[PDB]
Amino acid sequence: STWKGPYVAVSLLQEVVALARKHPNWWNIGQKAPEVINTYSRASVILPDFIACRFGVHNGKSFVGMEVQEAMVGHRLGEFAPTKATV
RNA sequence: GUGGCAACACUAUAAAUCAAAGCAAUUGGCAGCGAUAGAGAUGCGCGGUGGAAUAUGCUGUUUAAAUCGAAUUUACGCGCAAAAUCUUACCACUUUUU
């Protein structure tokens, strides 16, 4: 999907710009960004940078809080919001 | 009561109940009763299943919901000649009108 426009994260970006009132990524490298970020859609992709952000993702029953680290940068956020069919 | 060596052989009614117990020709269901016809109907062949994996449907388990019916033949590639949201009726949350 890299061809002809590779990234979709608009509502996540609206919340990210809400976080970006003093620093998007600790420009003031990262300090965990204690204000929680709670998205309402997991179809979003993940953009480079975006590190140390507390993302709360919807599972259809709740919001799942997961801290992003360096490995999950080229992913789509719905991969981290399962339906918990453990057994 | 008569006969006998007897087993019993007679003769011999009833008390009491029931509303039918019966009979003959049928018309249908059986055959563990035969003769004539028809079906890969077999024994005659070929290729499958059941062995492996995938697809796909169903039960059962769990999950918040795994929406609901189809249930032995004739249910299980079934309603679905198509579910990424919508289709969608089920759940979590937030609202709406009686």
Nearest of A13, A3, A16 to residue A52 by alpha carbon: A16
Please report, as a single letter, which amino acid is at residue A16.
Answer: V
Give the integer Cα–Cα distance in Å for A37 and A54: 6
Task: State, as a whole number of angstroms, the distance between the CA of A43 and the C1' of B30.
Answer: 73
Q: Which helix (H) or strand (E) holds A64?
A: strand A63-67
The resolution in angstroms reads 4.2
φ and ψ at A77, to 5 degrees? -60, -20
Report, in ranges, which bases of strand B sit under 7 Å from a protein C-beta: 62-66, 91-92
Q: After which residues is chain A broken (C to N over 2.5 A)?
A: 28
Q: Are A40 and A77 in contact (CB under 8 A)?
A: no
Structure tokens at A79: 């991969």
Of all nucleotides, the one whose C1′ comes closest to residue A83's CA is: B63
Q: Which residue is nearest to nucleotide B85 (CA to C1')?
A: A43
Q: Are A42 and A81 in contact (CB under 8 A)?
A: yes
| Cβ contacts of A10 within 8 Å, gap of 6 or more | none
What technique solved it?
A: cryo-EM
Vertex A55 angle, CA A54 and A58, to 5°: 150
